[PDB]
């Protein structure tokens, strides 16, 4: 088989492995090999690649800054994090699965595609770093990477890249970030129709909601976030800063016992057509970055001169409010491939049945 469809938005010209004849890895070693080699490849995953326990376990130092109850996460003291950022927190002993620490390195020009509902990677994530570019990650699930431990593993990492398309992916039960960009330039990136499942037995907010969602911290980034289902999170969903232009369109934010957006200095967000259902705090205020939340039909017409269409309203149901009208963000899209936006009315229904792996 192969890639289905084309990237919308900023990463529209992504080709990945192109027309290379599809390879079907049979083991975790072959998967790692194909992902890191210097040849363009179209890698088809038709089975579960479980890295859990392949590197054994290690007992090390950590801290418990959010409580000692089983429902809470604890953190590994990676690169002195507990000493520098949580000095007053109790020091604890932690036994983690070693495979989650270092993600699999993904080189340039690759198309990683899952077949049906079988493409699953467990215990170790993926990282597109050091100048690797032109990568397509579609229809796969990356789950179970040291859920109880912060710094025990990130699912998808992008740092120093360009042209990355994450589509129809499902991330769940991860120790720290599901998706993390930066601090180097990531340029054109499109994350679409994916499911960020925040339900976990261990949470930094001790409430079954994941706190480390999507962190956009790149230094020259243009990210299109479209048609995703952000479910059951409590923070960093998404946390935007650095020098990132984020186009958040038609995503469903659902069941957040905490907050969604964290817009810091260098974060420019254009949010339209999203649906917020049962999200306590939509945006943490005060905002240090800039925001155009398509606040009303009249102000939305301002998008017309550069977009060629008006911006779409966001819908709120049993949620906090949001209102930003920084029109200076609209002009940053001039000449760029801008993803289409549908009214918020049918978004929730469709997103639930179409977002994620296997859909």
Describe the structure.
There is one protein chain. The chain is mainly β. The protein has one domain (1-359): Pectate Lyase C-like. It is 7% helix and 36% strand. It is built from four helices and 28 strands. It has a 15-stranded parallel beta sheet that branches. Strands 1-7-10-14-17-20-23-25-27 form a nine-stranded parallel beta sheet, covered by helices on one side. Strands 5-3-4-12 form a four-stranded mixed beta sheet, with no helix packed on it. The protein is globular and about 60 Å long. The PDB classes it as lyase. The entry lists the keywords pectin lyase, beta-helix protein, pectin, plant cell wall, lyase. It forms a monomeric assembly. The entry is titled "pectin lyase B". The protein: pectin lyase B.
CATH class annotation: Mainly Beta
Question: Structural class of the helices, strands and pairings?
Answer: mainly beta
Number of helices: 4
Overall tally of structural domains: 1
Q: By CATH's scheme, which homologous superfamily applies?
A: Single-stranded right-handed beta-helix, Pectin lyase-like
InterPro entries: Pec_lyase, Pectin_lyas_fold, Pectin_lyase_fold/virulence, PEL
GO molecular function: pectate lyase activity; pectin lyase activity
EC number: 4.2.2.10
Protein name: Pectin lyase B
Summarize the structure.
This protein has 359 residues and is mostly beta strands. It contains 4 helices and 28 strands.
């Amino acid at each position: 088989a192969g890639v289905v469809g084309a990237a919308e938005g900023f990463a529209h010209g992504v080709t990945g492995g192109g027309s290379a004849s599809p390879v079907y890895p049979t083991t975790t070693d072959e998967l790692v090999s194909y992902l890191g080699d210097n040849e363009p490849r179209v890698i088809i995953l038709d089975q579960t690649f479980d890295f859990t326990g392949t590197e054994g376990t290690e007992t090390t130092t950590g801290c418990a800054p959010w409580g000692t109850a089983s429902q809470c996460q604890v953190a590994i003291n990676l690169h002195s994090w507990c000493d520098n950022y949580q000095a007053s927190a109790p020091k604890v002993s932690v036994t983690y699965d070693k495979a989650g620490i270092l993600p699999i390195t993904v080189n340039s020009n690759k198309s990683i595609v899952g077949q049906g509902t079988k493409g699953v990677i467990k215990g170790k994530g993926l990282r597109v770093v050091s100048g690797a570019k032109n990568v397509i990650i579609q229809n796969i699930a990356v789950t179970d990477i040291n859920p109880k431990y912060v710094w025990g593993g990130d699912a998808i990492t992008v740092d120093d890249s360009d042209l990355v398309w994450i589509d129809h992916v499902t991330t769940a039960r991860i120790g720290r970030q599901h998706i993390v960009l930066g601090t180097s330039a990531d340029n054109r990136v499109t994350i679409s129709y994916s499911l960020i499942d925040g339900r976990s037995d261990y949470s930094a907010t001790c409430n079954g909601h994941h706190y480390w969602g999507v962190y956009l911290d790149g230094s020259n980034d243009m990210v299109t976030l479209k048609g995703n289902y952000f479910y059951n999170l409590s923070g960093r969903m998404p946390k935007v800063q650095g020098n990132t232009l984020l186009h958040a369109v038609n995503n469903l934010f659902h069941n957040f016992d905490g907050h969604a957006f964290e817009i810091g200095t260098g974060g420019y967000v254009l949010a339209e057509g999203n649906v917020f259902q049962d999200v306590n705090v939509v945006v943490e205020t005060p905002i240090s970055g800039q925001l155009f939340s398509s606040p009303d039909a009249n102000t939305n017409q301002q998008c017309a001169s550069v977009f060629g269409r008006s911006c779409q309203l966001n819908a709120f149901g049993n949620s906090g409010s949001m209102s930003g009208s920084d029109t200076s963000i609209i002009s940053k899209f001039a000449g760029k491939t801008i993803a289409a936006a549908h009214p918020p009315g049918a978004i929730a229904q469709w997103t639930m049945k179409n977002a994620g792996q296997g859909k």
